[PDB]
Amino acid sequence: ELMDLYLKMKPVWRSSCPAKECPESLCQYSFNSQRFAELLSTKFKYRYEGKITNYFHKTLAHVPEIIERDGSIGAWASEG
Amino acid sequence: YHKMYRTVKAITGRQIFQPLHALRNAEKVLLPGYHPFEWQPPLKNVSSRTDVGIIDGLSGLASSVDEYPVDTIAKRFRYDSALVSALMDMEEDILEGMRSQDLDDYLNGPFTVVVKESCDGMGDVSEKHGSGPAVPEKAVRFSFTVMRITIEHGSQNVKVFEEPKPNSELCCKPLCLMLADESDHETLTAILSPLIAEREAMKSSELTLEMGGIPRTFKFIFRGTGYDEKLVREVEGLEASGSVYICTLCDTTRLEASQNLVFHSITRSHAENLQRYEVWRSNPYHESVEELRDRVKGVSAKPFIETVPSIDALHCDIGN
Amino acid sequence: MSLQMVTVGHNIALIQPGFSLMNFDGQVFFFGQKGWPKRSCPTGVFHFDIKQNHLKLKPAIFSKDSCYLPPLRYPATCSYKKHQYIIHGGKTPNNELSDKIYIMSVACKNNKKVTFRCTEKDLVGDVPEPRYGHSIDVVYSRGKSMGVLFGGRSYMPSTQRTTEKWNSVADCLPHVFLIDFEFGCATSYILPELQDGLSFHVSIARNDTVYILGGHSLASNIRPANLYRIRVDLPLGTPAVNCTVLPGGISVSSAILTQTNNDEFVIVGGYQLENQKRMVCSLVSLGDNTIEISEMETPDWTSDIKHSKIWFGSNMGNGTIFLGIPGDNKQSEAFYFYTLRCS
Amino acid sequence: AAEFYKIFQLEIGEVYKHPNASKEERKRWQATLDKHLRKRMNLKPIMRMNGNFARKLMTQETVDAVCELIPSEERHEALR
DNA sequence: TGGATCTGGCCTG
DNA sequence: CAGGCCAGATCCA
Ligand SMILES: [Ca+2]
Ligand SMILES: [Zn+2]
Numbered sequence: 027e028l029m030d031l032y033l034k035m036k037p038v039w040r041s042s043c044p045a046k047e048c049p050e051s052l053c054q055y056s057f058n059s060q061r062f063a064e065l066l067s068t069k070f071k072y073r074y075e076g077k078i079t080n081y082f083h084k085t086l087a088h089v090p091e092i093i094e095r096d097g098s099i100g101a102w103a104s105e106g
Numbered sequence: 107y108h109k110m111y112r113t114v115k116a117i118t119g120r121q122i123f124q125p126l127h128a129l130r131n132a133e134k135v136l137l138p139g140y141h142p143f144e145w146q147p148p149l150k151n152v153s154s155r156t157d158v159g160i161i162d163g164l165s166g167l168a169s170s171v172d173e174y175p176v177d178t179i180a181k182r183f184r185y186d187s188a189l190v191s192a193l194m195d196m197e198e199d200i201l202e203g204m205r206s207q208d209l210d211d212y213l214n215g216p217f218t219v220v221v222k223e224s225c226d227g228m229g230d231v232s233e234k235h236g237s238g239p240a241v242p243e244k245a246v247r248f249s250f251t252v253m254r255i256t257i258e259h260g261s262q263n264v265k266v267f268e269e270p271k272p273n274s275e276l277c278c279k280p281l282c283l284m285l286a287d288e289s290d291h292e293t294l295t296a297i298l299s300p301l302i303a304e305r306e307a308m309k310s311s312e313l314t315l316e317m318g319g320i321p322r323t324f325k326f327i328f329r330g331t332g333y334d335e336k337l338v339r340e341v342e343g344l345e346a347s348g349s350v351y352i353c354t355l356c357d358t359t360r361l362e363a364s365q366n367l368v369f370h371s372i373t374r375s376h377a378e379n380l381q382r383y384e385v386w387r388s389n390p391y392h393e394s395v396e397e398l399r400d401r402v403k404g405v406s407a408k409p410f411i412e413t414v415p416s417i418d419a420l421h422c423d424i425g426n
Numbered sequence: 427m428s429l430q431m432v433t434v435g436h437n438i439a440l441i442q443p444g445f446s447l448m449n450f451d452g453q454v455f456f457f458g459q460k461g462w463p464k465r466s467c468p469t470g471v472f473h474f475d476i477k478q479n480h481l482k483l484k485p486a487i488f489s490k491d492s493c494y495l496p497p498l499r500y501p502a503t504c505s506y507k508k509h510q511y512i513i514h515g516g517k518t519p520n521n522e523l524s525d526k527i528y529i530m531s532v533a534c535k536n537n538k539k540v541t542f543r544c545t546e547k548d549l550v551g552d553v554p555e556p557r558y559g560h561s562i563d564v565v566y567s568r569g570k571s572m573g574v575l576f577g578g579r580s581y582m583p584s585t586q587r588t589t590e591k592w593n594s595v596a597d598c599l600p601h602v603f604l605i606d607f608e609f610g611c612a613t614s615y616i617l618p619e620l621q622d623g624l625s626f627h628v629s630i631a632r633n634d635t636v637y638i639l640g641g642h643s644l645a646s647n648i649r650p651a652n653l654y655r656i657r658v659d660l661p662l663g664t665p666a667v668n669c670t671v672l673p674g675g676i677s678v679s680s681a682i683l684t685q686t687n688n689d690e691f692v693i694v695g696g697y698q699l700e701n702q703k704r705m706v707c708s709l710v711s712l713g714d715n716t717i718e719i720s721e722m723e724t725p726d727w728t729s730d731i732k733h734s735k736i737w738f739g740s741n742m743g744n745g746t747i748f749l750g751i752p753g754d755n756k757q758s759e760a761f762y763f764y765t766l767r768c769s
Numbered sequence: 770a771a772e773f774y775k776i777f778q779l780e781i782g783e784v785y786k787h788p789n790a791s792k793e794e795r796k797r798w799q800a801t802l803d804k805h806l807r808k809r810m811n812l813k814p815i816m817r818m819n820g821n822f823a824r825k826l827m828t829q830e831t832v833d834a835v836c837e838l839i840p841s842e843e844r845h846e847a848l849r
Numbered sequence: 850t851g852g853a854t855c856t857g858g859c860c861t862g
Numbered sequence: 863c864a865g866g867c868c869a870g871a872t873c874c875a
Contacts, residue, residue: 032426036423039417039419039422040419040423042272042273059368060368063367063368066367067367074364075364076361076364076365077360077364077859078360078363078364078367079425079859079860079861080335080348080352080353080425080860080861081421081422081425081426081860081861082426083352083353083358083363083364083367084353084355084417084422085417085422085426086367086368087353087356087363087367087368087369087370088353088355088356088370088372088417089417091371091372092372092415092416092417095372096331096416099416099417099419100273100419101253101272101273102222102253102272102329102331102332102416103272103273103331103332103418103419103420104224104226104332104333104334104418104420104421105273105419105420106224106251106272106273106274106275106277106278106332151584151587151588151589151592152588152589153588153589153590158590161590164593165589165590165591165592165593165594166590166591166592166593166594167593168593168594168595170644170700171680171697171700171701171735171736172559172625172626172642172679172680172697173500173559173579173595174443174444174499174500174517175443175736175752184589184590227862229862229864233813234813235811235812235813236811237811240752240755240807242755242756243757287756288862289864289865291460291461291462291519291520292442292460292461292499292519292521295519295520295521296521296593299521299592299593300589300590300592300593303589303592304589307589334861334862335860335861335862336860336861336862337862339861343462345462345464345465345866345867346464346465346860346861346865346866346867347860347861347862347865347866347867348859348860348861348866348867348868349465349860349866349867349868350867350868352860360868386494387493387494387495387496388493388546389491389492389493389494392490392491393490394490395468395469395487395488395494398494399468406462406463406468407462408462408496408518408520410520421861421862424862425860425861464866464867465866465867465868466866466867729781729801729838730797730800730801730804733801733804733805733808733838734804735808753800754800754803754804754814755803755813755814757814758796758797758800762797762800850873850874850875851874851875852873852874853872853873853874853875854871854872854873854874855870855871855872855873856869856870856871856872857868857869857870857871858867858868858869858870859866859867859868859869860865860866860867860868861865861866862863862864862865
């Protein structure tokens with residue numbers, strides 16, 4: 027289930043135009059983030075209690091606001 | 107290419123491929139320093155000459171025995187001239203885009219151009235022998251792309267050109283290549299200060315360019331989204347890469363970030379970080395080191411490159 | 427004339443040209459690190475302790491009301507006399523010049539630990555422009571203590587500055603400024619006996635006179651072998667300034683001064699030309715009204731010093747000079763450090 | 770060429786009069802040899818010796834730049 | 850016995 | 863594999 031949650035999350039910030047490529051995954055990103063966070067808190071308490079990593083925090087917190095402000099996330103990457 | 111041209115000459119008899127000198131003559135048109143551009147108002151601290159090509163990236167840094175030692179090689183382009191060349195390389199593209207949405211062809215409305223500047227260092231670049239300073243075996247590149255260009259028509263706006271492959275290697279146009287270290291800060295600031303000065307000067311200026319028989323004006327909006335987290339921290343004040351304060355977008359500490367993990371907001375900016383550095387340096391509230399750090403929320407440096415608070419998808423995927 | 431090799435611990439990657447050594451009641455401290463301060467030492471000052479030719483750099487904490495200052499890369503060194511220490515101007519790690527002035531003092535001290543006090547002071551009057559490489563000394567004329575500033579190197583004005591020559595530097599104006607520390611006042615005195623600027627020169631203080639010798643003029647790209655003696659008195663009204671040209675001066679830039687004995691100063695190292703090395707040392711037997719510069723025996727330099735291009739240092743205070751040699755490529759630890767005993 | 774490099778590294782320290790040497794002494798000899806080699810003939814230091822390094826180091830200017838760091842003259846003439 | 854002092858874990862490259 | 867920071871185990875006057 028953690029694996030499925032990550033695969034449901036990834037298109038949102040990897041799409042070059044999420045509003046026209048993955049609206050169904052976009053509209054439930056908040057619910058997926060909540061579910062992922064509660065899973066990490068409960069089932070994986072042995073690693074994520076009082077210590078979490080930068081990229082997990084970023085993915086679970088800041089993505090929708092960045093999408094709203096910019097329009098796309100993957101377009102402005104450093105992969106180019 | 108010379109070998110291929112010579113053998114095709116010898117066999118076929120005609121001249122199918124053009125000579126190298128002809129190629130080099132046609133080369134100069136695309137390179138910066140060939141088109142005329144006028145600013146209004148003129149850029150502050152930027153010369154009005156329109157034939158600047160490849161200039162030294164050190165910007166005439168003092169390299170005598172009496173001052174700070176320099177161990178870098180840097181060749182860079184003036185930002186405005188590079189933008190002019192990038193815009194002129196897509197003259198036909200802009201004309202086609204303006205034709206596509208049933209607009210005019212001689213319309214000279216103020217274009218709004220957004221540019222994504224990306225800077226990332228490299229490792230294991232082999233230093234060469236030969237005359238020069240004790241150059242470290244690290245290379246830092248600075249580059250920019252033209253994402254979208256819009257014109258103001260009527261009450262709303264309409265897009266003319268949008269890059270279909272924003273992450274391709276064909277759009278990351280280089281700007282400034284220095285063979286210096288990313289960790290070293292003094293040399294990085296010394297070499298990258300002129301580009302930041304030019305960008306700040308152009309933030310509030312109008313570029314005039316003769317676009318296919320009709321003069322049109324330009325505007326520039328810059329977003330620094332193409333930096334990795336380590337360089338973002340090393341530039342915009344934040345210390346190290348792993349500390350008590352984690353995100354470069356929110357003032358949330360590690361423990362409560364782990365505890366909450368779902369509810370956060372974006373607060374950090376560049377002017378705010380400048381104010382926080384001023385607070386740290388002046389110590390207005392007469393506090394100890396720990397309480398001053400808590401008040402300043404991890405800003406212990408002077409930011410000097412404006413980085414837009416975004417997330418880097420590639421390195422995010424790598425870390426996850 | 428004793429030269430000894432010194433080893434540095436796990437902070438050797440943090441000593442850069444332009445540092446200064448601060449002496450407080452026999453304790454020597456450090457300033458001018460690389461990059462913005464880290465969490466190992468957020469203040470920026472360091473405990474410069476050498477025991478058995480080994481150097482350890484323990485952090486030093488500021489006071490509660492202290493102001494945390496950026497690491498100045500080429501400041502101006504002064505020694506006030508209640509024993510405080512004043513630094514003026516220099517380069518920040520982001521390479522912009524500052525015209526601010528700071529005051530150093532020891533607020534409290536317990537066993538092997540210290541707390542410093544930094545004070546922000548704003549100058550009024552003819553504010554000197556931000557600059558680096560200059561020298562500032564204090565004089566005691568008729569019971570009144572007052573500081574004197576001389577020109578150095580500074581960036582071009584904010585109007586004739588261009589991005590292509592953004593890092594070009596030119597010597598400051600020949601003007602000699604006077605700073606009153608207790609009031610923070612500055613009055614500019616233009617004196618015809620001075621025609622060209624000086625940079626990276628040494629300054630020697632006495633009761634009411636300062637002896638500046640050497641210096642580099644970038645405008646003419648020459649180093650004069652001259653000597654200016656300035657005498658300042660403090661009447662009830664406006665101060666009067668007079669400088670006299672004296673013979674016997676040497677042509678040295680970026681030299682290092684030490685105070686070995688009373689009325690006895692020594693000069694070690696520097697650069698005569700761009701590729702020339704100021705290999706011999708000059709003794710400055712300071713006097714009441716006579717100046718005599720004589721050459722002592724040349725210390726037995728090592729091959730690394732004899733075949734390097736760059737060395738830089740500061741004053742340890744107890745008749746010792748701490749000079750360094752660029753070690754090798756980063757690829758021992760990028761720097762080799764030496765200590766030098768002055769009698 | 771590697772053997773000659775080690776011979777120069779030893780000779781710039783005068784091992785014939787100092788039969789016992791420390792690892793710090795050998796490291797300093799290596800560092801000064803690399804620095805002066807760069808300064809004079811402009812070869813960067815390398816850890817695995819190439820053939821271009823061999824061809825450039827097999828010159829008379831090489832023994833010149835080495836002997837301007839050897840105080841004695843008998844070593845100068847022997848190396849030459 | 851209460852801070853120094855290594856020391857390994859963790860974060861990004 | 864370098865580099866920096868933090869929680870933890872010794873430790874020594
Ligand atoms: Ca990279
Ligand atoms: Zn965050």
